[PDB]
Amino acid sequence: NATEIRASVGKMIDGIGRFYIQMCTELKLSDYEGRLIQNSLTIERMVLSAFDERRNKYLEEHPSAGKDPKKTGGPIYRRVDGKWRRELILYDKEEIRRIWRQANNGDDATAGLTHMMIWHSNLNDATYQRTRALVRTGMDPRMCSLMQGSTLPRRSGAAGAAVKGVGTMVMELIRMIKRGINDRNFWRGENGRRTRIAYERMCNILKGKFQTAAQRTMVDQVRESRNPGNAEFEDLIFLARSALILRGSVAHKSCLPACVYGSAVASGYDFEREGYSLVGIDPFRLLQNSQVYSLIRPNENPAHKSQLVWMACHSAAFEDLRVSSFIRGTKVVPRGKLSTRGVQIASNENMETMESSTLELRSRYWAIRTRSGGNTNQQRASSGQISIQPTFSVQRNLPFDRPTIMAAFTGNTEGRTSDMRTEIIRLMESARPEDVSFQGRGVFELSDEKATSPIVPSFDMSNEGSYFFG
Amino acid sequence: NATEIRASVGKMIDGIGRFYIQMCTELKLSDYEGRLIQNSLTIERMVLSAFDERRNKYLEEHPSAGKDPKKTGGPIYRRVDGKWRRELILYDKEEIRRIWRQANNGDDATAGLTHMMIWHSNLNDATYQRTRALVRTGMDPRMCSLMQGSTLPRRSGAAGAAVKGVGTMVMELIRMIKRGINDRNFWRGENGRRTRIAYERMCNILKGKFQTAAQRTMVDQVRESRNPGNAEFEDLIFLARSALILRGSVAHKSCLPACVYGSAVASGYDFEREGYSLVGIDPFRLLQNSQVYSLIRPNENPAHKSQLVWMACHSAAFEDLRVSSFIRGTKVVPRGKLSTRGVQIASNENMETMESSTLELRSRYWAIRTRSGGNTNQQRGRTSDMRTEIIRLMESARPEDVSFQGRGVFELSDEKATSPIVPSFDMSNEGSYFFG
Amino acid sequence: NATEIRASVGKMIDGIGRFYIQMCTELKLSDYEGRLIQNSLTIERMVLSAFDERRNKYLEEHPSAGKDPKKTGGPIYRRVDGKWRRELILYDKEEIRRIWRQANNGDDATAGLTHMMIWHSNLNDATYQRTRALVRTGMDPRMCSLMQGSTLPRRSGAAGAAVKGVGTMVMELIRMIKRGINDRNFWRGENGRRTRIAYERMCNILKGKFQTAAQRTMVDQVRESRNPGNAEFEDLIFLARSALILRGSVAHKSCLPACVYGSAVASGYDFEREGYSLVGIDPFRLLQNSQVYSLIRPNENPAHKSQLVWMACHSAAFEDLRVSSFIRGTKVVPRGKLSTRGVQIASNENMETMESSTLELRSRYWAIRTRSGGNTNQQRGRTSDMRTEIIRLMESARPEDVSFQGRGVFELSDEKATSPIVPSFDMSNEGSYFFG
Amino acid sequence: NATEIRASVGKMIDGIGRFYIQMCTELKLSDYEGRLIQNSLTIERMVLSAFDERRNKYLEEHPSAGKDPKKTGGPIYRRVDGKWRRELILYDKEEIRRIWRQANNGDDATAGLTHMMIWHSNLNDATYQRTRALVRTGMDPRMCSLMQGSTLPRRSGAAGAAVKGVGTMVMELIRMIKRGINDRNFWRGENGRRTRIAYERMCNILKGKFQTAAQRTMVDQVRESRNPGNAEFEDLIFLARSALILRGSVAHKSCLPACVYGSAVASGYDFEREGYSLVGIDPFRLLQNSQVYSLIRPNENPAHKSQLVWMACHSAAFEDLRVSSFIRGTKVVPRGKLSTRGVQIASNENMETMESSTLELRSRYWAIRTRSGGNTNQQRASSGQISIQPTFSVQRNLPFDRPTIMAAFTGNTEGRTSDMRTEIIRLMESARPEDVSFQGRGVFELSDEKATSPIVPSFDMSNEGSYFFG
RNA sequence: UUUUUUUUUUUUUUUUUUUUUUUUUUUUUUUUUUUUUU
RNA sequence: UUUUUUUUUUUUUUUUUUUUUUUUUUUUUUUUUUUUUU
């Protein structure tokens, strides 16, 4: 059944919106100031810093960074008669802990935490990607497309684990492998057992993320190595560059600004009654009647800022630019010529230059965002009969495809990497930049609610560039 | 004696044909509409839904799917002056239960049920095979050839059990093994005892299906595991890939469209008097003078549709294409380039595009279809030790060994199996593989 | 080096004796009342009930048994002018926890806990053995000799694990096996993982306890069963009846009454300076000048009570009676004709009949008690194949093979193990069997 | 816990007593006629004939015995001004079925059925025992003492199965064995499977009933025979004559007349509140203030009739006469010189001779009736150590009891009967007619309620005869 | 030179027993009565 | 001469995918900034 999931997510987002309402009440902010992305961003880093129970425990025993008992940051932006001023207001965690507890009807609301931290990961992926760490581990900077959910820490649950990219897991596992290579950390102690456990948990997350059997089997065999040394490093680099084309089925969770939920809840649009969804039309129509204000530099233009905000909201920064333009209806400028900077404001930037203005989020169309893969990346081995059965009793040969019959019969010793790299190469050669994917699905219009009739898009606009970076 | 079996099957098919006659009388259909495969198909799903006593009991306690007290589906296709229209006419089970009871002279006619459900399994195997479930259990999609009788549920008897393929049994047993692995279901309760019983019944069906002693012995030893866990999974996968070449002696029951029997019975050809057979010339000669109409899409061609219908009728979709072409006399196109779709029509397809036309079922020759294996097999502690002999037998096996010595393809004019003609194909590598 | 171990055990027993001194100070008992075994026994059950942190946690969530917040029992026996009276004085755990903490110089003193709980196990084995549980698991009552350390719970450490008998481990493992057979308890959850872990810990304790390679290998192979069912039950019963003769190298820890340590510490005999040992002459010479008073029934005789107390102190209740008589110098009466009862007094017994008197602990000789096996062993796919060598070794075994070559019984006057005297018994069949 | 069992049995007997009250209301009987055993006896055969669902199904397809649609018997005895008259009033089952259903608050009350049918078995065992069938199977008439619960049919549950004697099970199993010998009835059909199942159910009931390991093991090995022929017949006869001395732990359920419960319930003594027990003081004190009237022949004396009724009530007809006399306080006459007949009245006996009078049920003492065995029938094998452990390191022999060491080491082939008959004979020879049993337990006085202090009985009255038959 | 882990109710009236356990149906029997007779 | 058993929610939009899944903590990092520098 799907009604229960819809009711649960509706209750969750209703609690989130009511917490936004109460923060607006408590902060004594104006109507316009309640529609600012920066305030929600700072408040949500406060949120994560209050539920980072592991870091809370680590910092209680580590009283450093000067005045840091329980309070961090808090750069609240406020308006005086047109001008803007930032105040470093410090909030302790504990009162906000109870205000959450009262906001979700006595519950912890950790799922909502996962969605906000994923949405921060989405905005981070949209704004800046780290080739710095990608080459710190030595991997080439060609794979920036697989840094989805990179900023997400381990503390997130299965829902958070679903949206993390393959490359994010590759980076996380290489970190552990390098740490275990630097020092003899895999001893029979509890630390070794726990890092072992986290390792197989991350690995079965990985093998769940993939779709074709060959990569699942080679991930299974990578596990066989009880002592991760150097060979597994290139083994999993080969895994990553195979997933470049044999991409994993990674979900795309549609989270929206802290305000958008608050404005919707304040108007009385209860999500429990009519139901809510995270993949369907829902986050699209809530943005159809949502007003958002944002802060812009004197050199920054708002036109690219709105598009980057739409990137962050719908996590479409790693998608084809042409498709995003089609749903937008307007051309989406790649990051090469974006005359804008990061959404977050540096702590040293002055305030006389800063100017607030609206953001455009309206899109002409809407589409479903499933956690599936392309329908043109399944070119491996073969598909058909191997044996025959005699139906008529006729004196005839029984055709047997012998060379594949030996291939099926082996020993299953669960040990090999290059031998499967051979099928990786074969499949890559079979792959083409022409194979059309997602057959049977299309882009839909806003006026339709039950997915009745789509329109098939068709682009012949040469080589405008389907590459957000470079 | 064989006369009694012939008389029994003749009486059964006579009752089936008379039931077809009475449904034609009751439905007020025209002569052409009585020769449509779709009507018989829908009526026979009604048939199975009326004798699915287990599902009847399960659905009486489960009133769901909206308006479903006793009536399901019923998309009857009718002609108005050339055009076609579907009506969703709902029939309850019980009256058709009594009409059967009167159609078989007071008997239940469960054997006929088995043959119709097998014929549905034959058409399903001809049209679509499920690698979906084959990889849901994780088995590779290379073994689509052993999905014979896959759609057949357990309710069929020994006659139904004979025609189910080895791979069908492998899938059914792996389903039970995975269910017993997910939860501790093998307790000393009645459910565990009954699933145990069904397990040995399916297993001695399996060991009866095989021919060589090694696989029979390893199936015997697979039984010795009182707690089916993970090792038996690969054990029986090895059994399956051994049966790929060491094939089991599975029968091929020759059932024909619901109409073909009805037209034959209506003309007065009593099968009890002259006798009837399910393996011999009989279903061949009844199709020699049978007229069949079918529904075809505006893009579908009837030429491949007739060949696919012959596949479904004679269950030759898993055989060599060359042999089927020889009996046909015309080339049989493999499924790779069939510009056609499934025989059954989707519930949402429009009717202005649909067009009805004849089907060709005439074949130049006829052959016996025994439940034997290739002559190549006659020419030739745990499970792994026997896997060793499996491997050496596989190595001894060759793609050259000719089978079925002493038997041949026959002509239509002969009735007593007097003199055959030996076929000989040297036409390179046209492709003896229906899939791929 | 052995000096560090001697210093550690000396410090431990010094702390124990000082705790005895302080309890004597706090309880306001007389000099005679401080030499009573019953008071020390009750105080030491208080000790175990205060460090049973597992049971403390289990009872804090389970407030039952009426008035049981933190206090249990406490039947202190006191003298009025010759007569005796018991008072049910209740002591809470926590203050005694801190008094221990101050008694061991800020340390927990868990090792001392292990030795006191082992000494309770020694007295329990000396007094009463449970064929009740031995036949509750169905094992025959012939193996009462392998119930050493049976009362010891799991909470003890490696030192406690060393002295537990083979049969005690057999009983503990069969309990877990029967619990896992009754319900599907071996799931992938944390409980299954932890019981698994405890299982291999108890099993490598077992295989460490044995000496011959065959039984170690069969214990190794018993481990290979991931699902302990019924076959392992008889497998480990065969292991036990093989250990009947192929006995395991189990230690014998020489703990002494709560008072004996207190009297020695009170007199100023510091054990840290001169060193202390648990296997050598030490516990023998401390009893050479120790006075002990005990409570005796009007029908009980003190002569057998002193011998039973010596059994409990030196854990010689499972040894040959002849040898114990030789070290005693007087005949040791077997349990068949002991006109005495258990040392502990029932909660309902009256006090007018109870009479206090001295106990004799002096022994003419002393001997080393190593954790080795008889020299007879040095003279000599599944479980059944190794059971074959078990049977042939049993047949090779004889009731004549003399053991412990090169070692002998020593005199008290010698301190450095200079010259022993070889004993020799030809006194027919007096009976080398404490039970029966 | 024992409170729940007490509450359940109290509710059950309260329902039984209320059904007795309603039958007294419906039958229009007088106060004296409601204290007659015969009326309750006939009504309770009506009870069993109404819940004998198996026989109901068998007789619906078998309309014989003349007028027998739903009604059987019903010889109700009534008083006219001192004289007595029997009326053959026929009651159908179904209305009494619903009256039960309303009497137990909507429940079937099958447990109460088991207790009434056991109490009928108790009275039958007290009155008449069948050496007729005992020699029909050919077994000697010396074992009449093991016919406890003989009349009980299979339909009773575990509670009914507990009180059936060892000899009753022997007779029931020999019946099945002779039936399977007469015809090839053990085929692979459903009938063979079901009789097989009933066979192991009766056999594990048997092995649960015994106490010593040898007989349990030989019962286990008797099971090994898949085809019960002739050898098992003498095998289980040997089992029976071994159980003659190695008696099985068979319970003694204390059921009382149909009226006694009704009179107690009518007076308002609710058993749910104060609790009820079936083994303790309870059935004793209810008889301390119970009045019972009974029918007696002109030649029968009431003095022996009261004692026989006490036999039937407390199922002490198979016990020592001396002990029963001690609890009675008066001498109990053995069946050899009882100038009385069966309690039930023959259908042809005239009514002018029949006379009604009181029955004495008062007993001077009370005792617990546990389902245990004698503490002097445990003389088998030996008890003591077999091995020794070296405590001191002394150069000495290790005494091993070798001939028993071989005895323990065998093969466990689960096949033998005479070899264990050898230990049967050895144990029988070790057994003595002097061994005192039931140590630590004694006879109690009525005034005590919590089992405080007993008095030890002691009989030196020569050989009065501890044998009810003969 | 070898070591403090916790998972839903037990035990000191005492020394080898005693203890939260259950409605299945297959071809003709039985209340003249208590150990024979069919 | 070889045979009608029933156990808690599936399937005809279509031909080889798509679907009721979850808060763990171990010795010093990061919002001056967007792909280097430590």
PDB file of all heavy atoms in Angstrom, chain A residues 47-61, unseen atoms left out:
ATOM      1  N   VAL A  47      20.277  22.925  13.099  1.00  0.00           N
ATOM      2  CA  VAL A  47      19.527  21.683  13.272  1.00  0.00           C
ATOM      3  C   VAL A  47      20.466  20.484  13.284  1.00  0.00           C
ATOM      4  O   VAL A  47      20.412  19.632  14.189  1.00  0.00           O
ATOM      5  N   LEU A  48      21.342  20.401  12.283  1.00  0.00           N
ATOM      6  CA  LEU A  48      22.249  19.259  12.183  1.00  0.00           C
ATOM      7  C   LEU A  48      23.265  19.272  13.321  1.00  0.00           C
ATOM      8  O   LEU A  48      23.631  18.218  13.851  1.00  0.00           O
ATOM      9  N   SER A  49      23.733  20.461  13.712  1.00  0.00           N
ATOM     10  CA  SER A  49      24.639  20.566  14.845  1.00  0.00           C
ATOM     11  C   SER A  49      23.957  20.229  16.161  1.00  0.00           C
ATOM     12  O   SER A  49      24.641  19.999  17.160  1.00  0.00           O
ATOM     13  N   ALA A  50      22.624  20.249  16.200  1.00  0.00           N
ATOM     14  CA  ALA A  50      21.940  19.864  17.429  1.00  0.00           C
ATOM     15  C   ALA A  50      21.633  18.364  17.471  1.00  0.00           C
ATOM     16  O   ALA A  50      21.654  17.762  18.549  1.00  0.00           O
ATOM     17  N   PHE A  51      21.337  17.739  16.326  1.00  0.00           N
ATOM     18  CA  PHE A  51      21.198  16.280  16.298  1.00  0.00           C
ATOM     19  C   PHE A  51      22.470  15.518  15.937  1.00  0.00           C
ATOM     20  O   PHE A  51      22.402  14.293  15.784  1.00  0.00           O
ATOM     21  N   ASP A  52      23.622  16.170  15.821  1.00  0.00           N
ATOM     22  CA  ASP A  52      24.845  15.408  15.563  1.00  0.00           C
ATOM     23  C   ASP A  52      25.355  14.842  16.888  1.00  0.00           C
ATOM     24  O   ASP A  52      26.411  15.213  17.410  1.00  0.00           O
ATOM     25  N   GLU A  53      24.590  13.878  17.418  1.00  0.00           N
ATOM     26  CA  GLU A  53      24.850  13.354  18.758  1.00  0.00           C
ATOM     27  C   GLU A  53      26.267  12.810  18.876  1.00  0.00           C
ATOM     28  O   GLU A  53      26.906  12.942  19.926  1.00  0.00           O
ATOM     29  N   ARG A  54      26.777  12.201  17.805  1.00  0.00           N
ATOM     30  CA  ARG A  54      28.165  11.753  17.804  1.00  0.00           C
ATOM     31  C   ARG A  54      29.117  12.935  17.966  1.00  0.00           C
ATOM     32  O   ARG A  54      30.005  12.912  18.827  1.00  0.00           O
ATOM     33  N   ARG A  55      28.928  13.986  17.171  1.00  0.00           N
ATOM     34  CA  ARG A  55      29.770  15.166  17.329  1.00  0.00           C
ATOM     35  C   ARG A  55      29.505  15.879  18.648  1.00  0.00           C
ATOM     36  O   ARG A  55      30.421  16.469  19.223  1.00  0.00           O
ATOM     37  N   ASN A  56      28.267  15.848  19.146  1.00  0.00           N
ATOM     38  CA  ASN A  56      28.015  16.425  20.465  1.00  0.00           C
ATOM     39  C   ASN A  56      28.860  15.729  21.529  1.00  0.00           C
ATOM     40  O   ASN A  56      29.528  16.376  22.344  1.00  0.00           O
ATOM     41  N   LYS A  57      28.870  14.393  21.505  1.00  0.00           N
ATOM     42  CA  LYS A  57      29.695  13.630  22.433  1.00  0.00           C
ATOM     43  C   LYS A  57      31.179  13.893  22.231  1.00  0.00           C
ATOM     44  O   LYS A  57      31.925  13.972  23.214  1.00  0.00           O
ATOM     45  N   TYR A  58      31.627  14.025  20.980  1.00  0.00           N
ATOM     46  CA  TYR A  58      33.032  14.314  20.714  1.00  0.00           C
ATOM     47  C   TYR A  58      33.451  15.707  21.168  1.00  0.00           C
ATOM     48  O   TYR A  58      34.591  15.874  21.618  1.00  0.00           O
ATOM     49  N   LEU A  59      32.575  16.704  21.062  1.00  0.00           N
ATOM     50  CA  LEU A  59      32.925  18.068  21.438  1.00  0.00           C
ATOM     51  C   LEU A  59      32.760  18.341  22.925  1.00  0.00           C
ATOM     52  O   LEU A  59      33.415  19.253  23.443  1.00  0.00           O
ATOM     53  N   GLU A  60      31.902  17.590  23.618  1.00  0.00           N
ATOM     54  CA  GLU A  60      31.805  17.746  25.066  1.00  0.00           C
ATOM     55  C   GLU A  60      33.124  17.378  25.739  1.00  0.00           C
ATOM     56  O   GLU A  60      33.528  18.007  26.722  1.00  0.00           O
ATOM     57  N   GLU A  61      33.805  16.355  25.220  1.00  0.00           N
ATOM     58  CA  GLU A  61      35.126  15.997  25.722  1.00  0.00           C
ATOM     59  C   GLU A  61      36.231  16.826  25.081  1.00  0.00           C
ATOM     60  O   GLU A  61      37.397  16.682  25.463  1.00  0.00           O
TER      61      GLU A  61
END
